[PDB]
Structures are given as structure tokens and as C-alpha cells.
Amino acid sequence: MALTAALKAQIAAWYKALQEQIPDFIPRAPQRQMIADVAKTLAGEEGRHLAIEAPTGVGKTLSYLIPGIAIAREEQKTLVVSTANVALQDQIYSKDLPLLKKIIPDLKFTAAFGRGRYVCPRNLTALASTEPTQQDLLAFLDDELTPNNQEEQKRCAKLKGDLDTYKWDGLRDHTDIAIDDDLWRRLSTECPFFVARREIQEAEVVVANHALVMAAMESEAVLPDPKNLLLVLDEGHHLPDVARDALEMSAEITAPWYRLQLDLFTKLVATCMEQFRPKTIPPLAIPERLNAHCEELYELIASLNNILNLYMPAGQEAEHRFAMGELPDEVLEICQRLAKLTEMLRGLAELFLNDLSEKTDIVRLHRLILQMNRALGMFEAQSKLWRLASLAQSSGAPVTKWATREEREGQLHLWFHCVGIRVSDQLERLLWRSIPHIIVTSATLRSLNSFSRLQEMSGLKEKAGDRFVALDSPFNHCEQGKIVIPRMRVEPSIDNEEQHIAEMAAFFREQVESKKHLGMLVLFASGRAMQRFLDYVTDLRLMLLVQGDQPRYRLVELHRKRVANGERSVLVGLQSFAEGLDLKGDLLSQVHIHKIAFPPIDSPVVITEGEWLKSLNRYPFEVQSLPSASFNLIQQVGRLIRSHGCWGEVVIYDKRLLTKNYGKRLLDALPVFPIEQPEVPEGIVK
Amino acid sequence: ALTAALKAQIAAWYKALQEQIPDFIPRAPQRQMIADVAKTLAGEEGRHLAIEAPTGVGKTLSYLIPGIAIAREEQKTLVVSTANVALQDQIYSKDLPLLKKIIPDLKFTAAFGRGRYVCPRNLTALASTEPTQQDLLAFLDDELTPNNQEEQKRCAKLKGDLDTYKWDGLRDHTDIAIDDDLWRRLSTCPFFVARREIQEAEVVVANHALVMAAMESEAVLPDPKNLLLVLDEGHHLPDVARDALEMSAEITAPWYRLQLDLFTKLVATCMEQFRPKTIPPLAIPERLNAHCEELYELIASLNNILNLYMPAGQEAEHRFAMGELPDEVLEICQRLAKLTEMLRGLAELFLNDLSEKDIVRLHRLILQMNRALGMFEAQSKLWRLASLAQSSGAPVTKWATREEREGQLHLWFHCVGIRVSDQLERLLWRSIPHIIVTSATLRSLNSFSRLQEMSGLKEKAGDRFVALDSPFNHCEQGKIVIPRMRVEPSIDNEEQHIAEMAAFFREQVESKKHLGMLVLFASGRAMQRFLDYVTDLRLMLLVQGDQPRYRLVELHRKRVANGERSVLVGLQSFAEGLDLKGDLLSQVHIHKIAFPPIDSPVVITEGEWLKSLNRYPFEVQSLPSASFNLIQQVGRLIRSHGCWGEVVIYDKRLLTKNYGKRLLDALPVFPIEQPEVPEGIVK
DNA sequence: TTTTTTTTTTT
DNA sequence: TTTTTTTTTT
Ligand SMILES: Nc1ncnc2c1ncn2[C@@H]1O[C@H](COP(=O)(O)OP(=O)(O)O)[C@@H](O)[C@H]1O
Ligand SMILES: Nc1ncnc2c1ncn2[C@@H]1O[C@H](COP(=O)(O)OP(=O)(O)O)[C@@H](O)[C@H]1O
Ligand code: SF4
Ligand code: SF4
Ligand code: BEF
Ligand code: BEF
Ligand SMILES: [Mg+2]
Ligand SMILES: [Mg+2]
């Protein structure tokens, strides 16, 4: 419970070694506060988890890293630091942690990423063949990867050498060679993914992202045991959303495909029995029983195909969302029985998998193990899906339910989808009650000056011993920067995107001509808006580092290097650069914000949530839209001031901050800045 | 900190005490210990304080005065814990009353385990129900029925003294004899009255076992953060700790199959009738059944493996050397730890859900779930320890026992860490802000390293280690009398040696030079045997086992005060904290050097681990505790300036053997006389 | 009452 | 080096 004397001493010595390690170190009261509270929670002195809000630039990273590393070493535990995206992962791994390793020269830290971001060596080799192709029928059936053209081949040769000259580690984000979305789909499914994941076991600090932490809690195969984990959820305000996205379930239900899956599974169970018989035979493994079971399950799937197909236009890609997540009684009945039958088949598959796997006819057995694993995976998905479709509520809210008919290989496949609108109870099972003590931190945790929204979405509760701390900002923003809202003619509506982007490009272009700022950042709410904006500043492309051209944090580095040379450099990007990115002083003195980032509203889950909110007589704009845009605006504005020596301005090109009823509330959530309103040149939409 | 108001207050109380003790003689180490205990308890000087003061210095008042002052200034409960119930009673009926005069608003209570309280229901049944004559209907019911009428009458006078408020309900606080069988039936409302008194008492007088339990089952004491804790006779703490931290759980395969079947059916019935609005994955029937099957198969395998180590179909035992399990058994234990921990969590979750939630049926399910939780708590802790290779830098003792109860055999698995320093660190040292550990025997070979290694108290943590001096003039105040026993106190000579000791003792009584005597034995066997030679002296003997211990002490004091000779005879409980100044005790008879029994699986495994660390087990486990024991025993005699008399030690190995020097050198310097012994007539 | 539109990650 | 069974609790 109580912090040891060795531990407090160790934290104090490291934190003091910081004064000599940041030569321009200035004491920060909230940093000290957050060190103490983080130490208390992680060491098990006062409560379960800590949701601690500390404003942008306070220095939260070192605030949780220092105590976390101390307690990890003393307790022989693993500190897991999770952030919102790979760019912020890279920043912790490449900038914060190395600075801390100057103070702790034996610190061992790694970063963890999902398998999909790692290049596959077989695909890379095939993609980097000098003599690539024939347009053979043989080639068409043998469609192992071909280098589309010669320059792309050259890319793959470069990446292939740089893998073997060890510049590249295997991750899409960790090379300077730009790679295409489709080319990455080709490149990525001993190998870099396993040599990367091996380092987790011996690392004291693992830098992950929230998606990977969610998958890790449910898989239970990527991180160490939860009881041996110290977990910090940096930029924690994204956890519910990520959790909701992690717990979405989708499975194919196309009846002929489903019947074939059941046929194969029957055949596979029987062959396991005849070749590697278990000691006790599962009742469900008896052939008459097993295909009685499979026949009932198939007929249920066929009827659900008929029913769902009556909703959608025959023979076209389509979708149908059930309002309020309420299924018709017949469909719910079917779902409940499918949950039963697919769970039973899942359990049978798991049983055979364990039996075969314990047996470790080695090659024959390995083939059967892989097959049984694939069947097990399929029934796992099924079971989760139908158990979710059968719920009338989950965490006090409906479950979004919808079906799609989508195309692959010229064939339509029927898919069914379920998403819990609220997810708190699942967070309780996967994180809150599984990890002894967790830090949830961010500069934007409170909504309307309350932890109420967060408590509703995450499930964290005072009654369970969760603490909620709101810290102050040490910087005097009015003495360091200014918010500038140009008097644009057009609000950034939907009818005005071209006009507004052209007027923004014009003003921006004079700010570049002003030569007042070597370091600037341009932030957009959508890729389309950004790509559209780049059409107006083409003559400037040499000075721009744009998200998409090189991996995000490699762009950040290039920016740091140019600004250090007295060169004008402009970062252009999206959400990844709008949050957590740390550019001190001259590295970022002018931030351009394209818009208020109101979230998109077209998803089945978001509109089902909207109808549920309205059924509870709550306004969806107030609940699901305005806080998202407020939080985003606070983070974006927060890119500017990172120190008492930071300086400059935040241009916000959304006149609605003064124009609409919600503009006052948005500005009130921000740090206090003087506001200037300069005039705008003519915007020539092209 | 130690404010001026608090210094003055402690000062003033210690001032009034001089008038309440008119035999007062100034005691320097007493003053020192008072200042150190106040400093530590107020937080001024580190974390915890291990302070050794010699026997009789007056430690009780030394820690009581600062503790009460500081506890009162703030809003803390001073928990005074000592080694046994007899010492609890001595603090409660003697010392605390003595400074309650000075502080007439002082509130103090004693806390004991639930086992020491009578269940008023059971007492009522036994007193108000005639013995049944042999009738199956009576047998089938197995209602509490007194074996005979004598027993019924005695339960009736126990109930009369209870309801007349003449008996507090504690086994130790009535003079009516109660054998272990009858107390087993009388006990499970006095217990809740005692706990309520804990809630607003300024001083709570406990024992070490109850503190340990309070630290793991967090319900007997208040929030640790609001506690001041003194551990009187603290040299017992590691042992208590070790004994409390032993985990055992049944693993009988048929029994285990039964328990898993019941838990499965119980979970399903909860699901069907009080479904929690969130289903835990493990509660899905296909998964809970797969889980329980795997668990059962592991338990059956473990049963087979262990049955290979133990004598065939009988009461048996098997201990794993060095606490190292065969690799297959380690694998099984690790998997059992996971599986039982998961089932424990599921039972807890369901208990929480039912509990937060059709009163009669649901109450029934809640009690069933709480028992299931209990069973899986025991299992998961046991396997978690069985899985460890080391705890607190030492092996984990691991062994299985097969015992018979009602015509069937039960298989049990037991684990106990040999060192518990880290567990004491997590449960005590890091849980209470400031703790006094005090005793007359804290150092061993004139160093605090033994206590440091056993307890986990360390300087690094800001724990202080103080050794005070004795004011008393032992050489000018008493003698060590070692008679020339013909036979050593070995094993095939015990009858002979007890007959000689009885003869010498009998002449010491016939001399009439001592009004107060204490006879101390190392075993109940030896004491009972020696009593066979003094039956004619029975009327002046007060013997442990005949009345509760401290009530024997009180009778002893009354008789001695009225000029009648009195002889206390007892064991460990009379050997340590007992205080009899002056006339109450001028002759102490020590039967033996109390070397500890070397019989425990834990003690054997410790012996071989010491050996593998190239340490002589005699030097670490037997001799130091014999020295502490002898020092404490000898320390019963001299309690003051003007105390007088002698300590007869009937173990001639203090002169014959080579550890004799070291035992004698560790005592206060006493002249040693070696008188002749009468012939020993073996009865 | 109010109002709003597409980022990021992993399975 | 040599030792041998008290006490208390969940
Ligand atoms: N006491 C301090 N003095 C000076 N710079 C600091 C101090 N603490 C942190 N920093 C640096 O100031 C910036 C703080 O930013 P960061 O930790 O990214 O803030 P946030 O809390 O938004 O994550 C970083 O560059 C960090 O290295
Ligand atoms: N200053 C003193 N002078 C004389 N007797 C004292 C003094 N202080 C305490 N005593 C008494 O001496 C006896 C021994 O004290 P006690 O606390 O039993 O010693 P120990 O330190 O071994 O526990 C008690 O009766 C106590 O009240
Ligand atoms: S293992 Fe994953 S990465 Fe290595 S080759 Fe097979 S697929 Fe490509
Ligand atoms: S003690 Fe507890 S159980 Fe025994 S009677 Fe009083 S209340 Fe009922
Ligand atoms: F809150 Be900081 F800008 F990451
Ligand atoms: F040290 Be005293 F005998 F309690
Ligand atoms: Mg940050
Ligand atoms: Mg004492």
C-alpha cells in the first residue's frame, strides 16, 4: 500500500536528474502533482484506477513514465504505455523514452504494433524480382505477387535491401520509402513481426496503441499477464470509441458458403476421431448427433438469409439497419438458437484442437491442427456475433444490428453485424477489473467541467475506488500566444467546401509570404479537404511535409531538421498531427486549423445511438457531436504552447466560432488567448 | 510531529505514574524507550522501531504512555498486540487499569479470535435440553444435546453467569472447566460486543495471530492507516506470520468432482433465475463445463502422482525436499492456479451480482455462492504458492497429507513459505504508518541481523534498531542454581530426570524460604509427568490446564499477598511476559533448555535449505530460539530493584555441552551455585 | 429549444 | 558444531 522509501527516493532522484537533462528545465507544479498521484495509484496506495486530466503541454509523458518505470522495476512488472495512434507511439519511443534513457541508461523499452503493419518477407521477395512477369493464363492462376511496374519493383528492392541493411524494422511507418495502400496490402499477408513481438517479454516499457491493447486483452496472447501489468492509457479519452470499434462483430452468413463450412467441419471432426481418437468421445462428435446439429444450424441460417434478403434489393450491394437495435421477433428467435448452436460447435472445435495439440504422426497432425484452428476461429466469430445479436441491451444501451450484401470476386456475400453502443461493462471485464491499477490520462477528459461523460462512457466509477483529478495549466497562454480568427466570408458548410478552402488557402499563402514563422502546422478534419487544399499551394510543395507522402513521424523528424536549419517547413496532416504531437518553440509557431471537426454521423452505430439518445429525450448533437468537436479543438489549439518559451498563434478558419450558438462554448473550453480577427484576401476557387 | 503539547502530556502522565507506583525507582532505559516510541509513532524518526529492552525494565508503560497520548491527540486506535491470551489478560487487568486512574476517561478493550467466544445459541441448547436417550430420530437430527446431565448443569451455570454479566463469554475468562470437545460445541452475542468495543476503543489489546488475520481478512481492525501498532514480545512475529501464511486445500478427487458439479449447477441456476445483465464468458455452460473438466482431470492426475509417494491406502504424508516439486507436478500446479483463480473470480462476480440484487430463494443461492467463493479462494491461494520456486528469498515448503475423518480418506495439499519477510512487508510494514516491535530478545549474536532477515524490517526502509540496557543489579540480586543432576535431559532419560527434578524441587519447597515459585516446562508431557511426583503438594500448586492461565496468576497473587506459599506451574504462556515483583516470585524452576522441535515439514525443509547454503541448522533454527527462551524464562525472576531469589535450571547441559557457555553468556551475569540432588525415585 | 458529416487501429 | 513439540488464528 504505502509507497516505499526506496521508491519515493528513486522517483525524486530521476525527476531531479531531469533538471540537468532538459537544460531549459522549468519547474511545473502540475507535473509534480501528476507524478505523485500516478505513483499512488500504480503502487496500490489509494484506490483502483486514476483518471487524471492535465492540460496540453503540462508534460504528462514524463509525469507517468518516471513513476511507472520506478514501480515497474521495483515490482518486476511491465509498464504498458498506450496512446491513440502510431505517430504518438513513435514520438514516445523516439523522443521521450530516449531522453529518459539518458537518465536510466539500462532502461529496456520496446514498441508493439499489430501484425498488419509488418511487411511479410515472402511477399517482399516476390514483389522485388528483377524478371517479374508474363501475362500467362498460368500466371493468372498462379497469381503470386508481381511488381506492377518497374519503379514499384525498385521500391521493393530498396525496402528489401534496407531490411537486410537493417535500416528498416518491418513496420509500414518506420521507413522513408513511401508505400501504397494497395502495395502495403500485398506486402503484408523469424519474420519481423515475431522479432518485434519477442522484445515485449524482456522490455520494462512497452509502447502500444489502444486498438492493440483491446485486442491484447481479448486475445490474451500479445502482452504479459494482466496481473503483471502496469498500464497507462495516454490520450485516454479515445478508449470508449476504440473499445466500441474493437468489440464490433461481423460474420458472413451466406447460406451455401455456410453449408460448405458445416460439411467440412463434420468431415474434419470425423477424421480427427478416426486418426487421433480421444479417450472420451464428445457426444456432439457422434456423426448422427453432429449432423443433426449442423442441419438445424444450417436451416436457421437459410431462413435468416431469406428474411434478410427480403430487406435488400435482389442482386445488388445493399444494407439494412434495424432501428433502435430491435429485431423482429422471428429474427431474434433465430439469433438466440444460432448463439446456442454455434457456441456448441465452437466448444467442440476447441476441444479437438486442445486434444490434437497436446498430442505433439507429426506432419499429418500439424495439418489437422491448422484446419481445426481455422474452424475454431470461424465458430468463435459466429458465437460472439449471435450472442451479441440476441442481447436487447448491453451496458444500458441497445446493440446496433445490421446486415450487408457486399461483393467479392463477382459474388455477393451476406454479412451480419453487431455493435454494442455502450461498452462500459466490457471495459470492466477486459481492463478495469483485470489490471490492478491503470492510469487514464489526457488533456481533454472532462466534458462541461465534469467527469460525468467519461464515467458514463468508460464505466470508471468512484464506488469501485477510481479517482478523478483535474490539474491546472502552468503556462500563461495570453503572455505567449494569440488565437486569430480571420473574417472569412463563408462558414465551412457542405455547400461551401470549395469556396472556404480557397479563402483558407489565400490567407495561408500570405502567412507564408509574411516570413514570420519558420515552423507551422496545417490541420484538416478530412483527407479530402486536405488533398483539396494542396491543389492551391502546389507552387509551395517543396516546403510542405504532407501526411501520406512519408510515414507520419518521419515527416515530423524532417520538419524538426529543417526548422533547425532556419528553413521554412510546414507540416500538413490530420488527426495524427492534431493531438499529442510535441514541437517546442520555433519548431511550431503557427498552427492553422481548417475547421471545427464535427464527427461524421452516417454510421449505423452512430445513428442507432442517435435514435436511442432521442428515445431517452437527450439531444444527439449535445451528446455525441459537440463534445467531440470541443475535445478536438482543445487538442489542436494545444499544439502551440509546449513550454514557457513557446510562442506564436493559432489560426482557426471556422467563422462559426463567432457565428453559431456553440462557438462561445467552444472558445470557453480553450485556454485563455487574446483573439484577433484580420481580414482575408479574395479566394479564387479553381 | 512531537509537538510541545504532546511532549508535555506524555511527560505529565509519566509524572503522575510516579505517585501511582510508590515503589518507583528511576529507570533510565524506560525513559529512553518512551522518547523513542513517541518519536517513531509520531512519524518524527523513520518508519518503524525495533527496540530491545531487557526483562523487567518496564516496557508495557514505556510504549503504553506515548501510544495513548499520540492516539488520543490524533484520532487513531492504539493496537497493542502480544504473544498470547495470558499476556493479553495481563495488560488488560493490570497495566491498563493502572494508568486508567491517571486517565479516568481512557477506553480500552481486548480483541480475540472468534473461536474463543461462546455461541449463545449453542449454550442455550446445551443447558436447556436433556441428554437424549439413544434414539435414531435424535441421532438423525444431531441437535446439540449434552452427553450427560452433569454437562447440562454446567452449561446452565455458564449461561447463568453469562446472562448475569458475570462471564464475558470468552473461554479464558470463566473458572468453570471446559474440555476441548465441549468448547468445540459451545462455540460457532459476546463476540460482536467485543468487536463493537474495538470500534471506539483508544487501546485494543490483541495477539499476533489476530493481527495477522486482521491484515489478510480486513475486518477485525480499523483502517490500517488510522492505527498505532505495538508488537510486544515481537520476536514471535515471523513464526506467527509463517504459521498464518500456510495455505492448505483439499484435493480429494471424488470430493473435487462433487464440488465442481455443484458449482456448475449453481452457476446455471443463477443464470436461469437471476440472470446478471452482463454474462461473463466463463459462465457460458459449454465453457464452464470445459473449464471444470480440465480442472478435474488435473486434480485426478495430481491425486495419482501424490498417491505414488504415500503409504498405500492409509493416513500418510509426503514432503518434497527443498520445496522443489517434480516438473510434472509443477506444471499441474501452475495450471491449477490459473483454473482455480478464474473460478474464484467467477464466484466472486456472481456473489456481487446476486448480492446487489425474491428473498428466500435468492438468499439461499447467495449463501451457496459465498461458500463456493470460499472454496475457490482457498484453492487459488494454495496453487499460487505451489507454483512459486521461491518466496522472500527462500524455498516454499510443499507437502501432501492423507487424513481420515468419518471412515474416508481426504487428500490435502499444503504450502508455506519458509521466509515471509516480503509478505510481512506487504501486509504489515507497508500497511501501518508506524509500528513498534519490542521485546527483551530481539538480537541474537549481539546483532539485529537475525531479526532483520526474519522480519523484513530494514534500515533502507527507514526502520530504526535500538538496544537498551538493564538497570537492575542481577549479580547483587539473584543466583543461578544449577543442581548437579545425575542424568542429562535427553530422551531415553526423561523419566529419570523428571524424578530427580521433583526430588530437588520438593526439598526447595520444604525449606520454606520462598513464598512465590514458578515452575516452567518445555512440554505438557514433561509437566504432567512431573506432577505425578508432587501430588501431595497439590493444594499449593496452581497448574496450567486446571483454570484459565491468568486466573491462575490472580489466585497466585492473592495467596502470596496473604502470606500463603504458592507455586505456579505452566508452560510457554508463563515463561515470557508474566510479571510477579518481589514476594510474588522469588524462585523460578526451569525444567530444560527449550530447544524447538525439529519435526515440521517446514522446519526440515528449512534445515536442508540452510544446509545447501552451507549453514549449520543448529546454529540458525535451534540454538537462537533456545537462547531467547532461556533469557525470557530467567527474566521472570528480577522485575525490580529489591527483587531477589534464584532461578534453578535443571538442565546440566549448560555445563556439560559446548553450547552451554553461549547460553550462559547470553544471560545477565549471575553467580552460579551447583548444589547436590537427592536420589531420584522413579514412580 | 438547440444541431452535425468521414480519423485511426486491430482482429 | 547438535536439537525434539507452545500458541493462535482464517
Ligand atoms: N519541467 C519541464 N521543463 C521543461 N520542459 C519539459 C518539462 N517537462 C516536460 N517538458 C517537455 O515539454 C514538453 C511537454 O510536452 P508533453 O509531455 O508532450 O505534454 P503533454 O502533457 O501534452 O503530453 C515536451 O517536449 C517535454 O519533453
Ligand atoms: N519505574 C519503575 N519502577 C519500578 N517498577 C516499575 C517501573 N515501571 C514499571 N514498573 C513495574 O515493573 C513491572 C515490570 O514491567 P513490565 O512492563 O512487566 O516489564 P517488561 O519490560 O519485561 O514488559 C511492572 O509491574 C511495572 O508496572
Ligand atoms: S510468417 Fe507472416 S511474415 Fe513471415 S513469411 Fe509467413 S507470412 Fe510473411
Ligand atoms: S454468535 Fe453469531 S451465531 Fe452464535 S448466536 Fe450470537 S449471533 Fe447467532
Ligand atoms: F496533452 Be499533450 F498536448 F499531449
Ligand atoms: F521483557 Be519483560 F519480561 F516483558
Ligand atoms: Mg501527450
Ligand atoms: Mg513485557
Author numbering:
A (entry chain A): 1 to 189, 204 to 211, 212A, 213 to 374, 378 to 703
B (entry chain B): 2 to 189, 205 to 211, 212A, 213 to 373, 378 to 703
What does the primary publication say about this deposited structure?
The domain architecture of the ternary complex is similar to the binary complex, although there are changes in the relative orientations of the domains. Due to these changes, the protein now interacts with only ten bases of ssDNA. Although there are still three bases contacting HD1 and seven contacting HD2, there is no longer a base spanning the gap between the domains indicating that one of the domains must have slid along the ssDNA onto this base. Since the enzyme has 5’−3’ directionality, this would suggest it is the HD2 domain that has done the sliding. Consistent with this notion, the base at position +5 no longer stacks on base +6 (as seen in the binary complex) but instead would now clash with the P motif so becomes flipped up and over the strand to occupy the position taken by the +4 base in the binary complex. By contrast, the number of contacts between ssDNA and the HD2 domain is greater in the ternary complex. Upon ATP binding, a conformational change causes the HD2 motor domain to slide along ssDNA, while the HD1 domain retains a tight grip. The refined binary complex model contained one DinG molecule and one ssDNA molecule in the asymmetric unit, while the ternary complex model contained two DinG complexes in the asymmetric unit.
DinG is another member of the XPD family, that appears to have a poorly defined role in DNA repair. The proteins comprise four domains; the helicase (HD1 and HD2), arch and FeS cluster domains. The FeS domain, that is inserted within the HD1 sequence, contains an iron-sulphur (FeS) cluster at its centre. Here, we present the crystal structures of two complexes of E. coli DinG; a binary complex bound to a ssDNA substrate, and a ternary complex with ssDNA and an ATP analogue (ADP•BeF3), that provide information about how these enzymes translocate on DNA.
